Amino acid sequence: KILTTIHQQILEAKKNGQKLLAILLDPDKIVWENLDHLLLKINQSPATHIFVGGSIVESTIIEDLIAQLKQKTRLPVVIFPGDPSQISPKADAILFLSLLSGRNPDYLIEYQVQAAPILKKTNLEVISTGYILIESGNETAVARVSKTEPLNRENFDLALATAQAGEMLGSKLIYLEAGSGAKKPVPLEMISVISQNVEIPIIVGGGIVDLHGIKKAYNAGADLVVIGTAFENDSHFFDSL
Amino acid sequence: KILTTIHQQILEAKKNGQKLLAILLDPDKIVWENLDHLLLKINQSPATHIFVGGSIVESTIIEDLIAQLKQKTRLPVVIFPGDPSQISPKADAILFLSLLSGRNPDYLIEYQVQAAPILKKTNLEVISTGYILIESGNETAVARVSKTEPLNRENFDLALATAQAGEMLGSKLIYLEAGSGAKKPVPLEMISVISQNVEIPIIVGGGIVDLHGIKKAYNAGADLVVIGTAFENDSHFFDSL
Numbered sequence: 001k002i003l004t005t006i007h008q009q010i011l012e013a014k015k016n017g018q019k020l021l022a023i024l025l026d027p028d029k030i031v032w033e034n035l036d037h038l039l040l041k042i043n044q045s046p047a048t049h050i051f052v053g054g055s056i057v058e059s060t061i062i063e064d065l066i067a068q069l070k071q072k073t074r075l076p077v078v079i080f081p082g083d084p085s086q087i088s089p090k091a092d093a094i095l096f097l098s099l100l101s102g103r104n105p106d107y108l109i110e111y112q113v114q115a116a117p118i119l120k121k122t123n124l125e126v127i128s129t130g131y132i133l134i135e136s137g138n139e140t141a142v143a144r145v146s147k148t149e150p151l152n153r154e155n156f157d158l159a160l161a162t163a164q165a166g167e168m169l170g171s172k173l174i175y176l177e178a179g180s181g182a183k184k185p186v187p188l189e190m191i192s193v194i195s196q197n198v199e200i201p202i203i204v205g206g207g208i209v210d211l212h213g214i215k216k217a218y219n220a221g222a223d224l225v226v227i228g229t230a231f232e233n234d235s236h237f238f239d240s241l
Numbered sequence: 242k243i244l245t246t247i248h249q250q251i252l253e254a255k256k257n258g259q260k261l262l263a264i265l266l267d268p269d270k271i272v273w274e275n276l277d278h279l280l281l282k283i284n285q286s287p288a289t290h291i292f293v294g295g296s297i298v299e300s301t302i303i304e305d306l307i308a309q310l311k312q313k314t315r316l317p318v319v320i321f322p323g324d325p326s327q328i329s330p331k332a333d334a335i336l337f338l339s340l341l342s343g344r345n346p347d348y349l350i351e352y353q354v355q356a357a358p359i360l361k362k363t364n365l366e367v368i369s370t371g372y373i374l375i376e377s378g379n380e381t382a383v384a385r386v387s388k389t390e391p392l393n394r395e396n397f398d399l400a401l402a403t404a405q406a407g408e409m410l411g412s413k414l415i416y417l418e419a420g421s422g423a424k425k426p427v428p429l430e431m432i433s434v435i436s437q438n439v440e441i442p443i444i445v446g447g448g449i450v451d452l453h454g455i456k457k458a459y460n461a462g463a464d465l466v467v468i469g470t471a472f473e474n475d476s477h478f479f480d481s482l
């Protein structure tokens with residue numbers, strides 16, 4: 001590869017039609033006795049990025065995990081934060097999320113204002129990300145912790161308007177999120193509608209439990225797919241015959 | 242001049258050290274019998290932009306005013322909106338405000354999501370603007386209508402963090418706002434702290450009642466100053482000997 005910001009890496013990949021893949025590691029769900037093996041499987045996988053976050057956990061545990069990732073893998077490590085406490089200076093970048101599907105100001109601006117001076121004392125690449133929670137069948141942790149409601153999974157116009165408002169406000173990425181372990185993944189037609197009508201790259205995650213689901217999301221217009229649960233449940237998820 | 246987006250015009254002006262000046266016309270405060278004279282004075286003034294907004298008013302009245310401005314002046318007309326109803330397709334651009342000093346989600350994302358599909362059926366240039374209300378002595382209309390509180394005028398660190406979070410989220414401009422007819426304008430040291438520690442251009446307005454106040458704001462780091470009240474009160478405000 002070449003030395004680039006992660007933002008430029010994603011933009012170039014989208015322009016060149018090259019699909020990206022992030023494995024999400026949730027530090028609260030990591031069994032450390034098995035982490036060495038897990039990182040070997042990440043290295044062997046087609047993953048292009050490692051995302052870290054997805055649970056409220058003490059900062060030291062996140063820092064410990066990120067230190068292992070930076071030692072034992074060569075992938076960019078992007079923090080996927082729920083709270084400013086999850087900021088770790090050892091990561092490469094941070095998705096600076098705003099929960100655009102929600103109307104809880106803590107997750108629209110308050111935590112971001114708290115985070116800004118913290119991020120200024122790090123070398124993290126900060127990538128504004130419009131985070132849109134899509135209803136998926138059961139209540140997810142994102143909705144629980146944020147005390148917000150997801151966007152109706154059949155209201156394509158609202159999901160689009162939300163992504164477009166994000167883009168207009170200056171989001172550099174849209175992340176369409178069904179939630180960790182979602183029963184129903186983000187609808188493919190929603191991915192298509194949004195990817196055809198915004199210009200910025202689209203991340204899709206939540207509820208994707210087989211390779212076919214990844215391919216379908218890509219085909220529908222996802223530029224980067226996130227897999228957490230399926231790889232947490234099976235370190236061999238990406239194995240081939 | 243040359244044909245440019247307003248955003249690029251502001252960026253180039255900042256790079257070249259050329260200070261900009263907007264006259265704000267509030268359509269609810271316009272006496273129409275005197276508008277022809279008022280527009281002549283705008284044309285003779287050093288204004289580079291006309292901003293329109295600053296009161297809750299029916300859309301037809303805004304459209305009527307903007308039509309006159311587009312006919313009788315040559316300045317770019319930028320909508321300075323309080324609600325998606327104030328969008329008029331006849332303007333050149335719109336400051337797509339988010340009220341970063343406040344924690345009312347209507348003014349952080351809700352109205353922006355409502356606005357997005359409306360803006361998509363116009364040719365308006367949409368410029369993400371981090372709108373920061375600074376305490377100024379009395380309650381202003383911005384605080385009243387938004388049901389938010391302004392930022393303490395002595396808390397430079399918070400004002401900075403707010404502007405930095407805006408910048409990180411993708412704001413293209415910061416607008417430091419004391420409110421229309423403010424008793425105390427935005428502090429000069431606040432303008433300096435923010436202009437030295439964010440890279441995007443800074444608009445300052447609210448409470449500026451003489452030319453000296455404009456010069457001081459510019460000297461402190463404002464890239465563009467907005468004057469409403471002082472010109473509404475005296476069409477000859479910008480006259481020279």
Ligand SMILES: O=P(O)(O)OC[C@@H](O)CO
Pocket residue numbers: 024054177178179180181182204205206207208226227228229230
């Ligand atoms: O764990 P899963 O369901 O793959 O979802 C990943 C991610 O989008 C969750 O935040």
Ligand SMILES: O=P(O)(O)OC[C@@H](O)CO
Pocket residue numbers: 265295418419420421422423445446447448449467468469470471
């Ligand atoms: O009317 P004045 O006090 O000049 O303020 C202008 C503008 O900043 C108000 O929104």
Ligand SMILES: [Mg+2]
Pocket residue numbers: 204205206207208209226227228
């Ligand atoms: Mg998934």
Ligand SMILES: [Mg+2]
Pocket residue numbers: 207208209227228229230231
């Ligand atoms: Mg999964």
Ligand SMILES: [Mg+2]
Pocket residue numbers: 445446447448449450467468469
């Ligand atoms: Mg003023």
Ligand SMILES: [Mg+2]
Pocket residue numbers: 448449450468469470471472
């Ligand atoms: Mg004035």
